[PDB]
């Protein structure tokens, strides 16, 4: 099982994204679902997570400006993400623990995402 995210890609610095992921579609059991993050040799850190109930968790540097939600009609764990910084940019990976197991947990593929504002007035053609 391999999990899919869309939404990552060029960004301005304050600048927002609503990134998405396609989850197991298994949605006759609970499970937890997230999102972490890697940056270049860094360690993988968690960025937002929902328990089986909905509780929600944020990593440290969040400070307010992304929020995690999930879609069982669409089977889809999303993290809007607003003020985005230069220290955001890094992969992100979305992750579903089934019944909230992690040593089963199913991770996503990664999508970069690149906070830059020069770049991305550049690709977007503002
Ligand atoms: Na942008």
């Known amino acids: 099982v391999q999990l899919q995210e869309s939404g990552g890609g060029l960004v301005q610095v304050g600048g927002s994204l609503r990134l998405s992921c396609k989850a197991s579609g298994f949605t006759f059991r609970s499970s937890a679902m997230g999102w972490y993050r890697r940056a270049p040799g860094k360690q993988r850190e968690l960025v937002a997570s929902?328990?089986?109930?909905?509780?929600?968790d944020y990593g440290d540097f969040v400070k307010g400006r992304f929020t995690i939600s999930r879609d069982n009609a669409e089977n889809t764990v999303d993290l809007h993400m607003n003020s985005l910084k230069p220290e955001d940019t890094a992969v992100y990976y979305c992750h579903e623990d089934p019944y909230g197991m992690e040593s089963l947990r199913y991770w996503g593929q990664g999508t970069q995402v690149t906070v830059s504002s020069a770049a991305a007035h550049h690709h977007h053609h503002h």
């Open positions: 929902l328990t089986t109930t909905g509780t929600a």
